[PDB]
Short mmCIF file of C-alpha atoms and ligand atoms in Angstrom, two decimals:
data_model
loop_
_atom_site.label_atom_id
_atom_site.label_comp_id
_atom_site.label_asym_id
_atom_site.label_seq_id
_atom_site.Cartn_x
_atom_site.Cartn_y
_atom_site.Cartn_z
CA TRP A 132 33.94 -36.18 -35.90
CA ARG A 133 30.54 -35.05 -34.88
CA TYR A 134 28.20 -31.54 -35.02
CA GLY A 135 28.35 -29.49 -31.54
CA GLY A 136 30.54 -32.08 -30.01
CA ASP A 137 34.82 -33.35 -30.65
CA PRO A 138 36.98 -33.97 -31.63
CA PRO A 139 37.78 -30.21 -32.81
CA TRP A 140 37.55 -30.30 -36.67
CA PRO A 141 41.00 -28.15 -36.83
CA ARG A 142 42.50 -31.27 -34.94
CA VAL A 143 40.91 -33.72 -37.49
CA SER A 144 41.77 -31.45 -40.65
CA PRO A 145 44.53 -27.99 -41.03
CA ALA A 146 42.04 -27.11 -43.87
CA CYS A 147 38.94 -26.82 -41.64
CA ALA A 148 41.07 -23.82 -40.14
CA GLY A 149 41.30 -22.12 -43.78
CA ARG A 150 40.33 -17.86 -44.30
CA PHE A 151 38.00 -19.36 -47.41
CA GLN A 152 34.83 -21.79 -45.55
CA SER A 153 31.47 -22.81 -46.41
CA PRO A 154 28.61 -21.95 -46.01
CA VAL A 155 28.37 -18.12 -45.38
CA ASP A 156 25.71 -15.57 -45.33
CA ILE A 157 24.35 -14.46 -48.51
CA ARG A 158 23.98 -10.47 -48.57
CA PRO A 159 22.37 -9.56 -52.09
CA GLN A 160 23.08 -5.87 -51.79
CA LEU A 161 26.88 -6.98 -51.53
CA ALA A 162 26.85 -9.40 -54.36
CA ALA A 163 28.18 -8.71 -57.77
CA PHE A 164 26.27 -9.15 -61.34
CA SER A 165 28.74 -10.84 -63.81
CA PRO A 166 26.57 -11.12 -67.01
CA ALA A 167 28.81 -13.42 -67.67
CA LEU A 168 27.23 -15.98 -65.24
CA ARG A 169 25.34 -18.20 -67.82
CA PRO A 170 22.47 -20.76 -67.46
CA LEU A 171 23.56 -24.07 -65.70
CA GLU A 172 23.20 -26.72 -67.83
CA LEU A 173 22.38 -30.30 -66.95
CA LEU A 174 22.82 -33.38 -68.95
CA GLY A 175 21.85 -37.51 -67.93
CA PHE A 176 20.05 -36.05 -64.49
CA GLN A 177 16.55 -37.50 -65.36
CA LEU A 178 17.17 -41.24 -64.48
CA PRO A 179 15.18 -44.70 -65.11
CA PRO A 180 14.22 -46.58 -62.23
CA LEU A 181 17.17 -49.34 -62.59
CA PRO A 182 19.96 -49.14 -61.98
CA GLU A 183 19.19 -48.72 -58.28
CA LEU A 184 21.13 -46.26 -56.33
CA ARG A 185 22.71 -46.05 -52.89
CA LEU A 186 20.57 -43.81 -49.99
CA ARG A 187 22.92 -43.99 -46.33
CA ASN A 188 22.55 -42.78 -43.37
CA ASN A 189 26.15 -42.08 -42.78
CA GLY A 190 25.58 -40.10 -39.21
CA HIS A 191 26.04 -36.73 -40.15
CA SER A 192 23.61 -36.76 -43.52
CA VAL A 193 21.47 -38.96 -45.64
CA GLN A 194 23.75 -39.03 -48.72
CA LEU A 195 22.37 -40.82 -52.05
CA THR A 196 24.82 -41.90 -54.70
CA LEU A 197 24.90 -40.52 -58.19
CA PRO A 198 26.00 -43.23 -61.00
CA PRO A 199 27.80 -42.12 -63.98
CA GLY A 200 26.59 -39.83 -67.13
CA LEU A 201 25.55 -37.13 -64.75
CA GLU A 202 27.05 -33.83 -66.32
CA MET A 203 26.99 -30.35 -65.49
CA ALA A 204 28.92 -27.10 -66.98
CA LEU A 205 29.05 -23.75 -65.22
CA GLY A 206 29.83 -22.03 -68.01
CA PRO A 207 31.78 -23.12 -71.78
CA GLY A 208 34.92 -25.03 -70.31
CA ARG A 209 33.75 -25.19 -66.85
CA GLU A 210 32.19 -29.32 -66.59
CA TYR A 211 31.43 -31.02 -64.01
CA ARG A 212 30.39 -35.00 -63.35
CA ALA A 213 27.57 -35.38 -60.16
CA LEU A 214 29.35 -38.00 -57.34
CA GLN A 215 26.28 -37.67 -54.51
CA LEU A 216 23.77 -35.34 -53.21
CA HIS A 217 23.16 -34.74 -49.39
CA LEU A 218 20.19 -33.22 -47.09
CA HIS A 219 20.96 -30.36 -44.34
CA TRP A 220 17.78 -29.48 -42.03
CA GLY A 221 17.26 -28.38 -38.44
CA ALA A 222 14.60 -29.90 -35.89
CA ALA A 223 11.01 -28.83 -34.76
CA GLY A 224 10.34 -25.16 -35.28
CA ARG A 225 14.41 -24.69 -35.93
CA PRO A 226 15.30 -23.98 -39.29
CA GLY A 227 18.37 -25.95 -40.88
CA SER A 228 19.91 -24.67 -43.70
CA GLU A 229 24.00 -23.97 -44.09
CA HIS A 230 24.05 -20.99 -46.18
CA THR A 231 22.08 -18.24 -44.78
CA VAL A 232 20.34 -14.87 -47.10
CA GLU A 233 20.96 -11.47 -44.88
CA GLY A 234 20.65 -13.47 -41.65
CA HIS A 235 17.73 -16.22 -42.48
CA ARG A 236 18.23 -19.31 -41.91
CA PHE A 237 15.70 -21.79 -44.05
CA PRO A 238 14.47 -24.81 -43.27
CA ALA A 239 16.63 -27.14 -45.40
CA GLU A 240 19.69 -27.41 -48.00
CA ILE A 241 19.93 -29.60 -50.68
CA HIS A 242 23.64 -30.21 -52.16
CA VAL A 243 24.75 -31.95 -55.06
CA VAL A 244 28.41 -32.52 -55.12
CA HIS A 245 30.23 -32.61 -58.14
CA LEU A 246 33.98 -33.35 -59.15
CA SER A 247 36.22 -31.49 -62.22
CA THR A 248 36.02 -33.32 -65.81
CA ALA A 249 39.79 -32.50 -65.60
CA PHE A 250 40.37 -34.98 -62.64
CA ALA A 251 40.01 -38.87 -62.37
CA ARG A 252 39.10 -38.24 -58.17
CA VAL A 253 38.19 -36.17 -55.48
CA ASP A 254 41.53 -36.80 -53.27
CA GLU A 255 43.61 -35.70 -56.65
CA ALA A 256 40.30 -32.25 -56.65
CA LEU A 257 40.48 -31.26 -52.79
CA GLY A 258 42.23 -28.07 -52.41
CA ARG A 259 43.02 -27.60 -56.33
CA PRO A 260 40.98 -24.29 -58.21
CA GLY A 261 37.30 -25.31 -59.63
CA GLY A 262 38.20 -29.22 -58.44
CA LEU A 263 34.96 -29.76 -56.49
CA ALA A 264 31.60 -27.85 -57.69
CA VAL A 265 28.74 -27.68 -55.02
CA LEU A 266 25.39 -26.88 -56.55
CA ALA A 267 23.07 -25.99 -53.39
CA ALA A 268 18.92 -25.19 -52.88
CA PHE A 269 17.14 -24.03 -49.95
CA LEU A 270 13.95 -26.36 -48.82
CA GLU A 271 11.07 -23.64 -47.85
CA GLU A 272 7.18 -24.93 -46.43
CA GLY A 273 4.53 -25.17 -49.12
CA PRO A 274 1.05 -26.39 -49.28
CA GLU A 275 1.85 -29.12 -51.84
CA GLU A 276 3.60 -32.47 -51.20
CA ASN A 277 6.82 -32.18 -53.57
CA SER A 278 6.58 -35.58 -55.13
CA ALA A 279 10.23 -35.59 -56.46
CA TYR A 280 10.82 -34.99 -52.89
CA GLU A 281 8.48 -37.81 -51.98
CA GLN A 282 10.86 -40.82 -53.56
CA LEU A 283 13.41 -40.00 -50.88
CA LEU A 284 11.54 -39.16 -48.04
CA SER A 285 9.02 -42.42 -48.02
CA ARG A 286 12.68 -44.35 -47.73
CA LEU A 287 14.43 -42.54 -44.56
CA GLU A 288 12.43 -44.92 -42.01
CA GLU A 289 14.54 -47.96 -43.72
CA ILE A 290 17.90 -46.12 -42.68
CA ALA A 291 16.93 -44.75 -39.58
CA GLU A 292 19.62 -46.22 -37.98
CA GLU A 293 22.89 -44.90 -38.03
CA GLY A 294 25.29 -46.34 -40.55
CA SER A 295 22.27 -47.86 -42.40
CA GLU A 296 22.43 -47.83 -46.17
CA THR A 297 19.36 -49.30 -48.82
CA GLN A 298 18.59 -49.45 -52.61
CA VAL A 299 16.39 -47.07 -54.01
CA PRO A 300 15.02 -46.32 -57.86
CA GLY A 301 16.83 -43.80 -60.31
CA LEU A 302 14.60 -40.39 -60.25
CA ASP A 303 14.80 -37.33 -62.11
CA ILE A 304 17.48 -35.91 -59.65
CA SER A 305 17.04 -32.41 -61.52
CA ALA A 306 13.21 -32.39 -60.02
CA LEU A 307 15.15 -32.20 -56.43
CA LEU A 308 16.32 -28.43 -57.91
CA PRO A 309 14.76 -25.53 -58.55
CA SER A 310 13.28 -25.17 -62.40
CA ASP A 311 15.43 -21.61 -62.72
CA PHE A 312 18.73 -22.42 -63.60
CA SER A 313 19.58 -19.06 -64.53
CA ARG A 314 19.29 -17.03 -61.19
CA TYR A 315 22.11 -18.49 -58.75
CA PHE A 316 25.02 -16.63 -56.23
CA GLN A 317 28.36 -18.20 -57.32
CA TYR A 318 31.67 -18.56 -54.60
CA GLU A 319 34.61 -19.62 -53.86
CA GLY A 320 34.74 -21.71 -50.44
CA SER A 321 35.52 -24.85 -48.97
CA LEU A 322 33.66 -28.47 -47.64
CA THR A 323 31.50 -27.69 -45.08
CA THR A 324 33.03 -30.94 -42.91
CA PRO A 325 36.70 -32.36 -43.01
CA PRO A 326 38.69 -32.60 -44.50
CA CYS A 327 37.18 -28.72 -45.53
CA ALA A 328 39.32 -28.52 -48.71
CA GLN A 329 39.26 -24.87 -50.07
CA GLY A 330 39.01 -24.19 -54.16
CA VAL A 331 35.32 -25.73 -54.25
CA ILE A 332 32.92 -23.41 -56.52
CA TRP A 333 29.51 -22.81 -54.91
CA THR A 334 26.29 -22.00 -57.01
CA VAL A 335 23.59 -21.21 -54.78
CA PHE A 336 19.97 -21.06 -56.53
CA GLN A 337 17.68 -17.94 -55.83
CA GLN A 338 14.48 -20.14 -56.69
CA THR A 339 13.77 -22.16 -53.49
CA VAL A 340 11.90 -25.53 -53.54
CA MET A 341 8.86 -26.23 -51.78
CA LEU A 342 8.38 -29.00 -49.22
CA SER A 343 4.83 -29.79 -47.07
CA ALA A 344 5.58 -29.23 -43.59
CA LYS A 345 4.80 -33.36 -43.01
CA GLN A 346 7.99 -33.35 -45.49
CA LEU A 347 10.16 -30.90 -43.77
CA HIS A 348 8.84 -33.12 -40.49
CA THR A 349 9.68 -36.51 -41.96
CA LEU A 350 12.57 -35.19 -42.91
CA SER A 351 14.40 -33.25 -39.61
CA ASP A 352 12.86 -36.55 -37.26
CA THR A 353 13.41 -40.02 -38.52
CA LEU A 354 17.12 -40.77 -39.30
CA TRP A 355 19.22 -41.27 -35.78
CA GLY A 356 23.10 -39.83 -35.29
CA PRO A 357 26.43 -41.09 -32.93
CA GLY A 358 25.21 -41.83 -29.86
CA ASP A 359 21.20 -42.31 -29.17
CA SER A 360 20.44 -38.91 -30.50
CA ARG A 361 18.09 -37.70 -33.15
CA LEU A 362 19.99 -36.33 -36.72
CA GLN A 363 19.43 -32.74 -36.70
CA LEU A 364 20.57 -29.48 -37.27
CA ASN A 365 23.34 -30.75 -39.24
CA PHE A 366 24.50 -27.84 -40.61
CA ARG A 367 28.12 -25.98 -40.38
CA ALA A 368 27.84 -21.96 -38.21
CA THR A 369 28.09 -19.38 -41.13
CA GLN A 370 31.95 -18.74 -41.88
CA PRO A 371 32.73 -15.56 -42.74
CA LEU A 372 33.24 -13.73 -46.30
CA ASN A 373 37.04 -12.71 -45.63
CA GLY A 374 36.77 -10.01 -48.55
CA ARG A 375 35.75 -12.59 -51.02
CA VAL A 376 32.88 -11.09 -53.22
CA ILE A 377 29.92 -13.17 -53.64
CA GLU A 378 28.66 -12.90 -57.67
CA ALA A 379 24.99 -13.24 -58.90
CA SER A 380 23.87 -13.66 -62.58
CA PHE A 381 21.25 -11.58 -62.00
CA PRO A 382 20.97 -7.51 -61.33
CA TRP B 181 56.13 -27.27 -84.86
CA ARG B 182 57.34 -24.09 -86.88
CA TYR B 183 55.36 -20.45 -86.51
CA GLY B 184 53.81 -19.93 -90.09
CA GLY B 185 55.31 -23.39 -91.49
CA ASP B 186 54.83 -27.12 -91.22
CA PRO B 187 53.00 -29.58 -89.62
CA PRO B 188 49.03 -28.34 -89.13
CA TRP B 189 48.98 -27.62 -85.25
CA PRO B 190 46.59 -30.46 -84.73
CA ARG B 191 48.84 -33.20 -86.10
CA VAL B 192 51.14 -32.49 -83.67
CA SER B 193 49.14 -31.88 -81.33
CA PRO B 194 45.17 -32.58 -81.16
CA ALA B 195 44.78 -30.67 -78.28
CA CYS B 196 45.32 -27.92 -80.68
CA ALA B 197 42.22 -28.07 -81.99
CA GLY B 198 40.05 -27.93 -78.72
CA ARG B 199 37.04 -25.75 -78.64
CA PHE B 200 38.88 -23.03 -75.65
CA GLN B 201 42.50 -22.13 -77.39
CA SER B 202 44.02 -18.76 -76.79
CA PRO B 203 44.39 -16.09 -78.12
CA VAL B 204 41.98 -14.73 -79.00
CA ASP B 205 40.11 -11.01 -80.28
CA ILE B 206 38.95 -8.87 -77.29
CA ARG B 207 35.35 -6.65 -77.98
CA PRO B 208 35.70 -4.51 -74.98
CA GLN B 209 31.89 -3.48 -75.77
CA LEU B 210 31.15 -7.10 -75.65
CA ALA B 211 32.78 -7.62 -72.49
CA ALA B 212 31.26 -8.30 -69.07
CA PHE B 213 32.37 -6.11 -66.18
CA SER B 214 32.34 -7.57 -62.82
CA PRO B 215 32.63 -6.40 -60.48
CA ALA B 216 34.33 -8.98 -58.35
CA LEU B 217 37.67 -8.63 -60.04
CA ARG B 218 40.16 -7.43 -57.88
CA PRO B 219 43.42 -5.57 -58.06
CA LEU B 220 46.54 -7.75 -59.50
CA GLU B 221 48.53 -8.77 -56.06
CA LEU B 222 52.73 -8.72 -57.20
CA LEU B 223 54.95 -9.15 -54.36
CA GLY B 224 58.93 -10.35 -54.97
CA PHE B 225 58.90 -9.06 -58.24
CA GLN B 226 61.95 -6.69 -57.39
CA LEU B 227 64.84 -8.64 -57.79
CA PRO B 228 68.03 -7.76 -56.69
CA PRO B 229 71.38 -8.00 -58.78
CA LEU B 230 72.22 -11.46 -57.80
CA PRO B 231 72.09 -14.60 -58.41
CA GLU B 232 71.48 -13.97 -62.02
CA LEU B 233 68.21 -15.15 -64.63
CA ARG B 234 68.66 -17.64 -67.49
CA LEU B 235 67.85 -15.30 -70.52
CA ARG B 236 67.66 -18.49 -73.60
CA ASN B 237 66.92 -18.16 -77.56
CA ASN B 238 64.22 -21.33 -77.69
CA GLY B 239 63.95 -20.93 -81.36
CA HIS B 240 60.39 -19.89 -81.01
CA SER B 241 60.66 -16.78 -78.72
CA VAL B 242 63.77 -15.16 -76.25
CA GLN B 243 62.74 -16.92 -72.23
CA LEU B 244 63.89 -15.35 -68.88
CA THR B 245 63.42 -17.89 -66.35
CA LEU B 246 62.45 -16.52 -63.12
CA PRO B 247 63.81 -17.52 -59.35
CA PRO B 248 61.21 -18.76 -57.01
CA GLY B 249 59.35 -15.81 -54.35
CA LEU B 250 57.20 -14.25 -57.34
CA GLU B 251 54.01 -14.45 -55.89
CA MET B 252 50.51 -13.39 -57.39
CA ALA B 253 46.97 -13.19 -56.48
CA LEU B 254 44.29 -13.41 -58.90
CA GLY B 255 41.86 -13.05 -56.22
CA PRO B 256 41.74 -13.67 -52.21
CA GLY B 257 43.41 -17.11 -51.48
CA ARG B 258 43.73 -17.68 -55.48
CA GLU B 259 47.83 -17.47 -55.73
CA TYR B 260 50.58 -18.36 -58.05
CA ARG B 261 54.46 -18.11 -58.81
CA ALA B 262 55.76 -16.78 -61.70
CA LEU B 263 57.72 -19.36 -63.48
CA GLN B 264 59.27 -17.18 -66.88
CA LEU B 265 58.49 -14.78 -69.13
CA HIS B 266 58.77 -14.66 -72.77
CA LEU B 267 57.90 -12.58 -75.63
CA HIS B 268 55.98 -12.41 -79.38
CA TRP B 269 56.52 -10.13 -82.41
CA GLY B 270 56.25 -9.03 -85.64
CA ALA B 271 58.92 -7.81 -88.37
CA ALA B 272 59.77 -4.70 -90.26
CA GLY B 273 56.79 -2.36 -89.89
CA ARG B 274 54.48 -5.48 -89.77
CA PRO B 275 52.82 -5.90 -85.45
CA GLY B 276 52.96 -9.71 -83.73
CA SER B 277 51.24 -9.15 -80.86
CA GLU B 278 49.12 -12.55 -80.06
CA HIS B 279 46.16 -11.16 -78.53
CA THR B 280 43.86 -8.46 -80.91
CA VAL B 281 41.38 -5.43 -80.02
CA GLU B 282 38.59 -5.24 -81.87
CA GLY B 283 40.86 -6.53 -84.59
CA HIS B 284 43.96 -4.49 -83.73
CA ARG B 285 47.61 -6.36 -83.66
CA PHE B 286 50.05 -4.71 -81.28
CA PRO B 287 53.65 -4.31 -82.12
CA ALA B 288 54.53 -7.20 -79.26
CA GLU B 289 53.26 -9.22 -76.49
CA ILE B 290 54.79 -10.03 -73.32
CA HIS B 291 53.73 -13.13 -71.06
CA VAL B 292 54.35 -13.66 -67.80
CA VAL B 293 53.37 -17.89 -66.90
CA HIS B 294 52.79 -18.60 -63.49
CA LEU B 295 51.66 -22.21 -61.46
CA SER B 296 48.95 -22.32 -58.94
CA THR B 297 50.48 -22.98 -55.57
CA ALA B 298 47.85 -25.45 -55.27
CA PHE B 299 50.27 -27.41 -57.62
CA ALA B 300 53.73 -28.14 -56.81
CA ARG B 301 54.62 -28.85 -60.91
CA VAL B 302 53.52 -27.13 -64.26
CA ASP B 303 52.81 -31.00 -65.35
CA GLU B 304 50.18 -31.37 -62.56
CA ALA B 305 48.91 -28.52 -63.79
CA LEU B 306 48.82 -28.51 -67.50
CA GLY B 307 45.22 -28.87 -68.13
CA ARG B 308 43.01 -28.59 -64.76
CA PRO B 309 41.13 -25.73 -64.70
CA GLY B 310 43.07 -22.70 -63.07
CA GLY B 311 46.14 -24.05 -63.03
CA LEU B 312 48.53 -22.30 -64.74
CA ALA B 313 48.11 -18.37 -65.29
CA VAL B 314 49.26 -16.08 -67.73
CA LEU B 315 49.57 -12.12 -67.81
CA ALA B 316 49.48 -10.34 -71.09
CA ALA B 317 50.44 -6.95 -71.59
CA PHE B 318 50.71 -5.05 -75.40
CA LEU B 319 54.02 -3.36 -76.56
CA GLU B 320 52.98 -0.32 -78.66
CA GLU B 321 55.55 2.07 -80.07
CA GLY B 322 55.92 4.59 -78.03
CA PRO B 323 59.14 8.38 -78.23
CA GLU B 324 61.40 7.29 -75.39
CA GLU B 325 63.52 4.10 -74.70
CA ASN B 326 62.25 1.99 -71.97
CA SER B 327 64.76 1.10 -69.53
CA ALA B 328 63.65 -2.10 -67.90
CA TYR B 329 63.04 -3.47 -71.61
CA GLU B 330 66.38 -2.57 -72.50
CA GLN B 331 67.47 -5.18 -69.89
CA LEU B 332 67.00 -7.74 -71.39
CA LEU B 333 66.89 -6.05 -75.26
CA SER B 334 70.86 -4.87 -74.89
CA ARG B 335 71.62 -8.77 -74.62
CA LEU B 336 69.17 -10.18 -77.65
CA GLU B 337 72.38 -9.85 -79.28
CA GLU B 338 74.77 -12.84 -77.68
CA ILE B 339 71.62 -15.30 -77.97
CA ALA B 340 70.92 -14.55 -81.33
CA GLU B 341 71.63 -18.08 -82.77
CA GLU B 342 68.48 -21.14 -81.43
CA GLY B 343 69.21 -22.70 -78.28
CA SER B 344 72.27 -19.71 -77.37
CA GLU B 345 71.64 -18.64 -73.81
CA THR B 346 73.50 -16.22 -71.48
CA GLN B 347 73.18 -14.96 -67.47
CA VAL B 348 71.67 -11.47 -67.08
CA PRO B 349 71.56 -9.96 -63.70
CA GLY B 350 68.71 -9.26 -61.47
CA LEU B 351 66.28 -6.60 -62.74
CA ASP B 352 62.49 -5.34 -61.93
CA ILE B 353 59.86 -7.90 -63.41
CA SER B 354 57.07 -5.42 -62.50
CA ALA B 355 58.96 -2.69 -64.53
CA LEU B 356 57.96 -4.44 -67.34
CA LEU B 357 54.23 -4.69 -66.54
CA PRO B 358 51.51 -1.36 -67.29
CA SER B 359 50.60 1.03 -64.73
CA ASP B 360 47.18 0.15 -63.53
CA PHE B 361 46.79 -3.42 -62.07
CA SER B 362 43.32 -2.93 -61.45
CA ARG B 363 42.31 -2.66 -65.10
CA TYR B 364 42.05 -5.89 -67.15
CA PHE B 365 40.75 -8.90 -69.11
CA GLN B 366 40.29 -11.95 -68.28
CA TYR B 367 38.77 -15.74 -69.63
CA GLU B 368 39.83 -19.24 -70.05
CA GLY B 369 42.25 -20.29 -72.45
CA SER B 370 44.82 -22.62 -73.55
CA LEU B 371 48.91 -22.43 -74.07
CA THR B 372 49.19 -20.39 -77.85
CA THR B 373 51.99 -23.46 -78.73
CA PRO B 374 51.87 -26.86 -78.32
CA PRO B 375 50.71 -28.56 -76.50
CA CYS B 376 47.53 -26.21 -76.25
CA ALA B 377 46.67 -27.29 -72.76
CA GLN B 378 43.25 -25.59 -71.67
CA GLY B 379 42.25 -24.50 -68.34
CA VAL B 380 44.41 -21.54 -68.38
CA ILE B 381 43.46 -18.30 -66.79
CA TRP B 382 44.27 -15.19 -69.28
CA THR B 383 44.95 -11.77 -67.95
CA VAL B 384 45.18 -9.08 -70.02
CA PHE B 385 46.16 -5.45 -68.92
CA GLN B 386 43.57 -2.72 -70.51
CA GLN B 387 47.05 -0.53 -70.66
CA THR B 388 50.13 -0.64 -72.86
CA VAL B 389 53.61 -0.55 -72.63
CA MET B 390 55.47 1.55 -74.81
CA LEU B 391 59.02 0.77 -76.50
CA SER B 392 60.88 3.08 -78.71
CA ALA B 393 60.43 2.35 -82.70
CA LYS B 394 64.43 1.02 -82.24
CA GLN B 395 63.69 -1.10 -79.47
CA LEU B 396 61.40 -3.06 -80.99
CA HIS B 397 63.66 -3.34 -84.00
CA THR B 398 66.16 -4.94 -81.76
CA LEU B 399 63.41 -7.05 -80.76
CA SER B 400 62.41 -8.59 -84.73
CA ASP B 401 65.24 -8.60 -85.95
CA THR B 402 68.58 -9.56 -83.50
CA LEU B 403 67.28 -13.54 -83.30
CA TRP B 404 67.41 -16.80 -85.66
CA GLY B 405 65.08 -19.45 -84.90
CA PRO B 406 64.62 -22.89 -86.38
CA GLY B 407 66.78 -23.69 -90.07
CA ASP B 408 68.57 -20.53 -91.45
CA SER B 409 65.41 -18.38 -90.40
CA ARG B 410 65.00 -15.04 -88.83
CA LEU B 411 63.05 -15.66 -85.28
CA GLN B 412 60.03 -13.14 -86.16
CA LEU B 413 55.57 -13.25 -85.97
CA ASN B 414 55.79 -15.27 -83.82
CA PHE B 415 52.08 -15.42 -82.78
CA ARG B 416 49.30 -17.72 -83.33
CA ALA B 417 46.25 -16.04 -85.02
CA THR B 418 43.33 -15.63 -83.12
CA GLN B 419 40.95 -18.10 -81.74
CA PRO B 420 37.08 -18.07 -81.88
CA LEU B 421 35.28 -18.10 -78.05
CA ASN B 422 32.70 -20.64 -79.17
CA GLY B 423 30.47 -19.04 -76.01
CA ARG B 424 33.63 -17.97 -73.57
CA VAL B 425 32.27 -14.34 -72.83
CA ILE B 426 35.58 -12.15 -72.09
CA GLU B 427 35.34 -10.50 -68.67
CA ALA B 428 36.81 -6.79 -67.83
CA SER B 429 37.29 -5.88 -64.24
CA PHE B 430 36.20 -2.00 -65.17
CA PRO B 431 33.28 -0.58 -67.10
N1 LIG C 67 28.78 -31.04 -47.05
S1 LIG C 67 29.72 -30.52 -48.46
O1 LIG C 67 30.35 -29.33 -48.26
O2 LIG C 67 28.46 -30.44 -49.27
C1 LIG C 67 30.76 -32.34 -48.45
C2 LIG C 67 31.73 -32.00 -47.54
C3 LIG C 67 32.70 -33.39 -47.30
C4 LIG C 67 33.19 -33.93 -48.88
C5 LIG C 67 33.63 -34.70 -48.59
C6 LIG C 67 33.78 -35.95 -49.87
C7 LIG C 67 33.03 -35.77 -50.74
C8 LIG C 67 32.08 -34.66 -50.84
C9 LIG C 67 32.00 -33.84 -49.88
C10 LIG C 67 30.80 -32.48 -49.72
N1 LIG C 68 52.72 -18.52 -75.29
S1 LIG C 68 52.29 -19.30 -73.57
O1 LIG C 68 50.57 -19.39 -74.12
O2 LIG C 68 52.52 -18.05 -72.63
C1 LIG C 68 53.10 -20.46 -73.59
C2 LIG C 68 53.17 -21.42 -74.36
C3 LIG C 68 53.75 -23.08 -74.33
C4 LIG C 68 54.57 -23.33 -73.11
C5 LIG C 68 54.91 -24.58 -72.79
C6 LIG C 68 55.44 -25.09 -71.13
C7 LIG C 68 55.10 -23.79 -70.50
C8 LIG C 68 54.41 -22.98 -69.93
C9 LIG C 68 54.02 -21.95 -71.76
C10 LIG C 68 53.13 -20.66 -72.51
ZN1 LIG C 69 26.57 -30.43 -47.44
ZN1 LIG C 70 53.35 -16.67 -74.97
#
């Protein structure tokens, strides 16, 4: 499978034709304030330099495999473990976030994918209610260099080739995410690549993360994908809410 | 295990000492209004007279086995099939609801137990978040005979003995539930007997159903339980929320 070029995605996984897919356009006006949504809690995200982490150009994103030990709670009794994180971006002058706010596409987006601590494996969690949880944050142009992101961005040149990987030192994974864990959107959706299984809880931060224009250029300009093509605009088309209500942790 | 007997339920099932157990005390003024909570959808609940349904004294409750085809949705794509329903009740002038409202115990309580359509079997859903969903309604004393309940209450006579069962005509299961499907409490908890599995979504109707004094007496006074005992007071004490916020579908 590929972005903007066959095989159709439903031919690959029937679930890519589900009614309740991601990503979506968030309209803060139409979002339901629910005071039940408490601040997110992360434990174990401040990793030491060893052991090293695998960072892979899988031809559709740059993915960092996370170690055991990273615990995330959406609430009381809603407990997850982190599996991996990856990035969606655009191209020169073209934004590449997957979610949009009131139609606005941001330059890039980070996904931290988590498994419910009721399941031992992704294959058991797929399509099950709350089986997987993704933390999502927009990346926007700022005037400073983000030093958290520099640790990963400085290594992209080593994995320029499609299907290439390198080992990188552990780092504060929570420093790749906004500082505000209390203000977010939450809805139920899908994986955004085959098999596009439903039952995924998406949590989308209101606060964005700032990278420098060069950082965003390094992200969009370094990696290569299927064929002799740049790895760029690696975002799925926005999917209709189809009657789902997006909740907001804030009024 | 027995009710108000021994052993200690944590000795039978250590799961019964989990942090997120049911039932709970609902305090409506501390409930969180979430507008995302939609009206419950129940299709296929209007059963014809044939085939007949199994009604069973199991020593802990009276249990009606439900056929296939009773579909329930808590939201969009969050679907369930009804498996069975059973009751909780007190004794001569003593109430026996499981859930309580600001400390008030109601005469009796109906539980309609459903299985997520993402799971083929109950044993796969046990302990998984959203695997099971229970619809709970309070039964209160009213001036009139309830004709839906009479279909069950009039058959308790011939299953008075622990482990006896009878076949009853199909009835309209939705006629046992309250008027307004848009008005309910919701939280995540447990089975209220061993094995006390967590991940059960509890929906408690705001509105009650009314039975005659005589009907409530028939419920509390007809059935025999473990040993040469009356099957009465078959409820579990209220359990601490431990940071869980109870949600309300109405302001
Ligand atoms: N881009 S995504 O929704 O965040 C995504 C899509 C497909 C996956 C398949 C397996 C594990 C994690 C996955 C994450
Ligand atoms: N009272 S309850 O929470 O509705 C309850 C208790 C024990 C069960 C055991 C097996 C299947 C369903 C069950 C439901
Ligand atoms: Zn992604
Ligand atoms: Zn029950």
